[PDB]
Design an enzyme around this catalytic site. Structure first.
Site, PDB file in Angstrom:
ATOM      1  CG  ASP A  32     -39.238 -49.332  30.748  1.00 19.54           C
ATOM      2  OD1 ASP A  32     -39.841 -49.706  31.764  1.00 19.54           O
ATOM      3  OD2 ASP A  32     -39.035 -50.076  29.738  1.00 19.54           O
ATOM      4  CG  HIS A  64     -40.669 -54.469  33.716  1.00 10.19           C
ATOM      5  ND1 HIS A  64     -41.537 -54.529  34.736  1.00 10.19           N
ATOM      6  CD2 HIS A  64     -40.534 -55.743  33.264  1.00 10.19           C
ATOM      7  CE1 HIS A  64     -41.938 -55.776  34.929  1.00 10.19           C
ATOM      8  NE2 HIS A  64     -41.358 -56.545  34.030  1.00 10.19           N
ATOM      9  CG  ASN A 155     -45.747 -58.709  25.157  1.00 12.74           C
ATOM     10  OD1 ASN A 155     -44.937 -58.793  24.256  1.00 12.74           O
ATOM     11  ND2 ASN A 155     -45.480 -58.303  26.411  1.00 12.74           N
ATOM     12  CB  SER A 221     -40.791 -55.173  27.312  1.00  7.85           C
ATOM     13  OG  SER A 221     -42.118 -54.700  27.342  1.00  7.85           O
TER      14      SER A 221
END
Ligand code: CA
Ligand code: CA
Length: 275
Positions: A32, A64, A155, A221
């Site tokens: 990430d 994130h 998403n 996520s």
């Protein structure tokens, strides 16, 4: 005082914690934006940066990566939140820049890094609409090397009758994770398709943020690290189970929800999965 994010309880992680299973000695790579190693509620063991302009994997300019990492393994203490596998050995594999974007070559390099460094579990809370032979080859090699590979489904919501699962989640060797809320309802944004495997909490997920903060994020996520973390708990109980066994256990002991195109096998239950 320490708070337990709803999602941790929803998956039944605390039952295992009570038993003395907290993911000790299991190496989890968060692929990430990096992980803020200065966060008091996190313990980062190592990692690497694949981003050419950002050489420190322990600086998260995006936020994130730190948030996903907290879901996986925020420490069990008297502050902040609690991870699914609070004793796991956490690795920051930075493959996204401050803007949250990254090149495929960077992502693939990070997967290759994870394999070479003997990660037990990989978490990829990332997704793209297209794949590549190289992306498939890397995930396939990780799985052939015994690594549990977990990814956010995407998403994209619904699109007629088509699969909206992104890559690498879309590949068979990868566990693809969709998002539910606290009521077990599918989040409207959660990607759908035959490639969806399991569901995990992904709405208003509280976790760690850079600079000794905490805050809520929503997305597949946020759902994925609950499964990565769950894989770490199972491995702490059954060190000799193969990645195949871990995967089958997670998929076979779910709480069934609606149709598999929208919910895959259902909501994971680590307590049932752990036997
Ligand atoms: Ca804590
Ligand atoms: Ca898959």
């Amino acid at each position: 005082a320490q708070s337990v994010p709803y999602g941790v309880s929803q998956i039944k992680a605390p039952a295992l914690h009570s038993q003395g299973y907290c993911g000790s000695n299991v190496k989890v790579a968060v692929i990430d934006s990096g992980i803020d190693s200065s966060h008091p509620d996190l313990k980062v063991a190592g990692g690497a940066s694949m981003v050419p302009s950002e050489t420190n994997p322990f600086q998260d300019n995006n936020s994130h990566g730190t948030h996903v990492a907290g879901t996986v393994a925020a420490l069990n203490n008297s502050i902040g939140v609690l991870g699914v596998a609070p004793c796991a050995s956490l690795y920051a594999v930075k493959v996204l820049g401050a803007d949250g974007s990254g090149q495929y070559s960077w992502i693939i390099n990070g997967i290759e890094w994870a394999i070479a460094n003997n990660m037990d579990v990989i978490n990829m809370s990332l997704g793209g609409p297209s794949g590549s032979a190289a992306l498939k080859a890397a995930v396939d090699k990780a799985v052939a090397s015994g690594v549990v590979v977990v990814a956010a489904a995407g998403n994209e919501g619904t699109s007629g009758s088509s699969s909206t699962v992104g890559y690498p989640a879309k590949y068979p060797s990868v566990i693809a994770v969709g998002a539910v809320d606290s009521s077990n309802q599918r989040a409207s944004f959660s990607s759908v398709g035959p490639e969806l495997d399991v569901m995990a909490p992904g709405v208003s997920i509280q976790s760690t943020l850079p600079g000794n903060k905490y805050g809520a994020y929503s997305g597949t996520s946020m759902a994925s690290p609950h499964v990565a973390g769950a894989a770490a708990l199972i491995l702490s109980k059954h060190p000799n189970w193969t990645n195949t066994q871990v995967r089958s256990s997670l998929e076979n002991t779910t709480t069934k929800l609606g149709d598999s195109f929208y919910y895959g096998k259902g909501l994971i239950n680590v307590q049932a999965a752990a036997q």
